Scaffold this active site. Structure first.
Site, PDB file in Angstrom:
ATOM      1  N   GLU B  44     -33.192 -10.640 -33.677  1.00 36.95           N
ATOM      2  CA  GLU B  44     -32.225  -9.590 -33.395  1.00 36.95           C
ATOM      3  C   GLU B  44     -32.307  -9.126 -31.943  1.00 36.95           C
ATOM      4  O   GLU B  44     -33.315  -9.303 -31.258  1.00 36.95           O
ATOM      5  CB  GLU B  44     -32.437  -8.401 -34.338  1.00 36.95           C
ATOM      6  CG  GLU B  44     -31.327  -7.356 -34.302  1.00 36.95           C
ATOM      7  CD  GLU B  44     -31.665  -6.109 -35.085  1.00 36.95           C
ATOM      8  OE1 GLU B  44     -32.764  -6.057 -35.671  1.00 36.95           O
ATOM      9  OE2 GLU B  44     -30.836  -5.176 -35.112  1.00 36.95           O
ATOM     10  N   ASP B 109     -48.441  -1.917 -25.934  1.00 37.43           N
ATOM     11  CA  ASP B 109     -48.016  -1.146 -24.779  1.00 37.43           C
ATOM     12  C   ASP B 109     -49.124  -0.171 -24.421  1.00 37.43           C
ATOM     13  O   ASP B 109     -49.789   0.372 -25.306  1.00 37.43           O
ATOM     14  CB  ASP B 109     -46.713  -0.388 -25.052  1.00 37.43           C
ATOM     15  CG  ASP B 109     -46.027   0.072 -23.782  1.00 37.43           C
ATOM     16  OD1 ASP B 109     -46.719   0.312 -22.771  1.00 37.43           O
ATOM     17  OD2 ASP B 109     -44.787   0.204 -23.796  1.00 37.43           O
ATOM     18  N   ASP B 111     -49.828   3.142 -21.537  1.00 39.19           N
ATOM     19  CA  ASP B 111     -49.145   4.023 -20.601  1.00 39.19           C
ATOM     20  C   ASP B 111     -50.088   4.482 -19.498  1.00 39.19           C
ATOM     21  O   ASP B 111     -51.311   4.478 -19.644  1.00 39.19           O
ATOM     22  CB  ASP B 111     -48.552   5.241 -21.323  1.00 39.19           C
ATOM     23  CG  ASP B 111     -47.533   5.987 -20.477  1.00 39.19           C
ATOM     24  OD1 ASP B 111     -47.677   6.012 -19.240  1.00 39.19           O
ATOM     25  OD2 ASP B 111     -46.587   6.564 -21.050  1.00 39.19           O
ATOM     26  N   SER B 160     -44.050  -2.541 -17.358  1.00 44.46           N
ATOM     27  CA  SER B 160     -42.696  -2.049 -17.615  1.00 44.46           C
ATOM     28  C   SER B 160     -41.967  -1.736 -16.317  1.00 44.46           C
ATOM     29  O   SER B 160     -40.858  -2.228 -16.080  1.00 44.46           O
ATOM     30  CB  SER B 160     -42.737  -0.812 -18.514  1.00 44.46           C
ATOM     31  OG  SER B 160     -42.908   0.372 -17.753  1.00 44.46           O
TER      32      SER B 160
END
Ligand SMILES: [Zn+2]
EC number: 2.7.7.102
Lengths: 182, 386, 232
Positions: B44, B109, B111, B160
């Site tokens: 998707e 991920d 941060d 990112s």
């Protein structure tokens, strides 16, 4: 156009004796005796309705193999045109395409699909139920009951007050009520 | 760190979708040689145009019409999404409650806001080389974790552009493991457990886990340098007051005694170690341990984990080389071969790569180098395919 | 001690004596109730808890020494015993609970006595990863094993045939930081082997158990099995 209030109790019809014909029965407000008295209603203009559920291919009905072509609403409309008139001589019709739903016992068909909604007056005869075409898969709405058809189209909640908009008078009374309205 | 003008972004994506996307390499990297049927079609995508209209149920059969529609719309944020149980773009056909998510590439991920408990170099939108020392060091541990005790070799790493770094690994079958395994590995790597609420965030128990041993061996090579060189965290009351309030108290005044008789920030930690040699982590036995001091060191530079993004099969994340409009910066491939030579400030934005090409393919500018990592991973995939 | 110890599976469609049927029924039920009692009396590791049971259990024809493939007597008795009592408790949670719990603890005990080589080889016969380390790796990895987990004391770890695993089923031995890791092929003492065996057993067993309970009506058309229909 004119109108007059009344009540309704009975809803009677029969397909064979005459198709596309319904009868309603109940009470009618009358001012002469300040009461409600007998009357009925005849009803023409009954619509057999069909929902065309398609395939997506030109599959040979005699061996069952795909061929590599999509389907258009125009296409299934064509097969309607040249299949009904092929074996049932459609005189005139009307139809629209709709995306509809199904959640009951039929294999592999989903609750979201193409359908060609075809209307036509009960004048025309009926067909085999599970009928299919070369391009489409099936059609719902073959053995339908004209009675429930009218009901679940006009959405009546059972017995309730009504009146008669556009009342046109009949040919020759065959009910037994002092008055009558078609 | 952000973008400064959305004025250029329309034309920038306009050209990017046209001739700045590895549609060949991308179609490949996703479909995986088409070894599976209904594999790509259900893989998707989620697309996000102006006013951030993010929308699920996006997919195309092969690369050609994929392109054509991508250029027809030019979405401004694009998430790759797990191959759900059936047709995404025709989701509402089958009986409801029968459409779910089967198999997903395993995502990670981390941060920079993670480190904000002590991070004093820059802001939540602005950075500097100091905080980026963490974006250079932490990845090493996480990477070598899967490189030495998880039996995988399909790892890929991206930063990112604003805060986080990504890892979209598509291991042989981990793409098809249960959410339970996701939560498991998460629990495994969740060592320093601290946000902004608890102080003694690491009650490290007695015996070590050799994982932590290699962790330490990485710590004493890359933490103290940044700490006492790029920050010198014992510089004023502020920083060390965010420090001493996690410590036992028998000596808790000698540390400040060393705090305010100072011309550096070295003898402070030195006498810290010293009194620890005379302190008793265990009143019982003669094992004077680095529990508290190394908890300090680690907690001050440790990859803070997410508890819901590395287990769920619903959070979707950006596409390879899909623009981050709010930084200009686009997905930058990151490698151990590059961890020793990365800088966030020099690596380019969408504006900068555009001005690069605003001068045939990615085969001219530094984008062919940047996708050398991409096509290298792809090469490994070719080797993954028998 | 016997081959008996095995993971229940594959109902044995023979055809047998009605007498032997109700016999096995009663026998097995006796064994169950007893084990429960004996257990709740003492604590597990006490040698009364062993002696008494290894007396009773051997008395009721379920554990002797080596013989032929599967038509040895006591293993067959165990087999048909269980795959009958399956029809017993399919009508509660409390019931199915009690049955599971008891069979669980029994298998635990009855299994805890096999010789080590027989242990590991029959694990091999059970499923794939049920395989053992080479004891050289004990020397090679004493630091890893000991310092890694608190589930072992000092250096005196016995000559246990430690085992190679896929992490994919280690789903609690590792997340609790209780084992060394070699690319998810963690190495764990026998204790947690028994643990994991028993847990997967409980899972699969319940998963089977519910099925018959969803397929009862057959018996309803017979009355020879009227006691065990719902009358134990
Ligand atoms: Zn700064």
């Amino acid at each position: 156009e004119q109108v007059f209030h009344f009540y309704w109790l009975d809803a009677y019809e029969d397909q064979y004796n005459q198709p596309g014909v319904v009868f309603l029965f109940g009470k009618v407000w009358i001012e002469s005796a300040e009461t409600h008295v007998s009357c009925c209603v005849m009803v023409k203009n009954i619509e057999r309705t069909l929902y065309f559920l398609p395939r997506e291919m030109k599959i040979d009905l005699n061996t069952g193999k795909e061929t590599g072509t999509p389907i258009s609403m125009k296409d299934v409309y064509e097969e309607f045109d040249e299949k009904i008139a092929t074996k049932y001589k459609i005189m005139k019709f009307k139809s629209k395409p709709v995306e509809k739903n199904y959640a009951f016992e039929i294999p592999d068909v989903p609750e979201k699909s193409e359908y060609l909604e075809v209307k036509y007056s009960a004048e025309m005869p009926q067909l085999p139920q599970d009928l299919k075409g070369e391009t489409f898969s099936h059609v719902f709405g073959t053995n339908t009951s004209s009675l429930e058809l009218f009901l679940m189209n006009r959405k009546i909640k059972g017995p309730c007050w009504l009146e008669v908009k556009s009342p046109q008078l009949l040919n020759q009374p065959v009910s037994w009520c002092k008055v009558e309205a078609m | 760190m952000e973008t400064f003008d959305p004025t250029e972004l329309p034309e920038l994506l306009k050209l990017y979708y046209r001739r700045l996307f590895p549609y060949s390499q991308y179609y490949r990297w996703l479909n995986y040689g088409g070894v599976i049927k209904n594999y790509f079609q259900h893989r998707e995508f989620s697309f996000t145009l102006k006013d951030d209209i993010y929308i699920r149920y996006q997919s195309f059969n092969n690369q050609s019409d994929l392109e054509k529609e991508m250029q027809k719309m030019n979405p401004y944020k694009i998430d790759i999404g797990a191959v759900y149980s059936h047709r995404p773009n025709q989701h509402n056909t089958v009986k409801l409650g029968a459409f779910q998510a089967q198999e997903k590439e395993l995502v990670f991920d981390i941060d920079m806001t993670d480190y904000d408990d002590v991070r004093r170099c820059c802001s939540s939108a602005d950075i500097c080389p100091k905080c980026w020392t963490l974006m250079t060091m932490a990845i090493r541990i996480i990477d070598r974790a899967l490189k030495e005790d998880f039996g995988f070799k399909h790892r890929l790493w991206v930063y990112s552009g604003r805060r986080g770094v990504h890892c979209w690994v598509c291991d042989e079958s981990v793409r098809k493991l249960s959410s339970a395994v996701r939560s498991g590995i998460v629990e495994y790597l969740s060592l320093v457990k601290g946000g902004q609420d608890v102080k003694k965030k690491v009650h490290l128990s007695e015996k070590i886990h050799p994982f932590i041993r290699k962790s330490i061996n990485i710590i004493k090579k890359y933490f103290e340098e940044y700490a006492l060189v790029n920050q010198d965290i014992l510089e004023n009351k502020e920083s060390w007051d965010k420090i001493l309030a996690l410590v036992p108290e028998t000596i808790h005044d000698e540390l400040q005694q060393s705090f305010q008789k100072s011309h550096n920030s070295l003898q402070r930690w030195e006498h810290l170690k010293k009194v620890a040699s005379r302190y008793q982590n265990n009143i019982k036995n003669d094992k004077y341990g680095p529990w508290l001091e190394w908890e300090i060191m680690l907690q001050y530079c440790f990859p803070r984990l997410d508890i819901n993004v590395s287990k769920g099969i619903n959070h979707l994340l950006k596409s390879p080389f899909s623009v981050h409009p709010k930084t200009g910066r686009i997905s930058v491939p990151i490698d151990l071969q590059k961890v020793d030579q990365f800088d966030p400030f020099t690596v380019p934005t969408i504006s900068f790569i555009c001005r690069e090409l605003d001068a045939r393919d990615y085969k001219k500018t530094s984008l062919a180098p940047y996708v050398k990592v991409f096509e290298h991973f792809l090469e490994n995939l070719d080797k993954s395919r028998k | 001690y016997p081959h008996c110890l095995q993971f229940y599976l594959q109902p044995p469609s023979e055809n047998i004596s009605l007498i032997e049927f109700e016999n096995l029924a009663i026998d097995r039920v006796k064994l169950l109730k007893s084990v429960e009692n004996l257990g709740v009396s003492y604590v597990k590791g006490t040698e009364q808890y062993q002696s008494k049971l290894e007396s009773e259990l051997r008395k009721l024809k379920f554990s002797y020494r080596e013989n032929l493939e599967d038509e040895y007597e006591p293993r067959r008795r165990d087999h048909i015993s269980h795959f009958i009592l399956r029809l017993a408790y399919c009508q509660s949670e409390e019931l199915r609970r009690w049955f599971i719990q008891q069979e669980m603890d029994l298998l635990r005990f009855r299994f805890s006595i096999l010789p080590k080589d027989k242990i590991q080889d029959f694990l091999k016969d059970s499923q794939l990863q049920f395989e053992a380390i080479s004891d050289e790796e004990k020397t090679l990895r004493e630091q890893e094993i000991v310092a890694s987990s608190p589930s072992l004391s000092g250096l005196k770890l016995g000559f246990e045939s430690i085992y190679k695993i896929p992490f994919a089923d280690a789903l609690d031995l590792f997340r609790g930081r209780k084992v060394y890791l070699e690319d998810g092929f963690a190495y764990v003492p026998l204790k947690d082997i028994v643990a994991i065996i028993l847990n997967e057993f409980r899972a699969k067993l319940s998963k089977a158990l519910a099925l018959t309970a969803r397929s009862l009506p057959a018996v309803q058309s017979d009355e020879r099995l009227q006691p065990l229909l719902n009358h134990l």
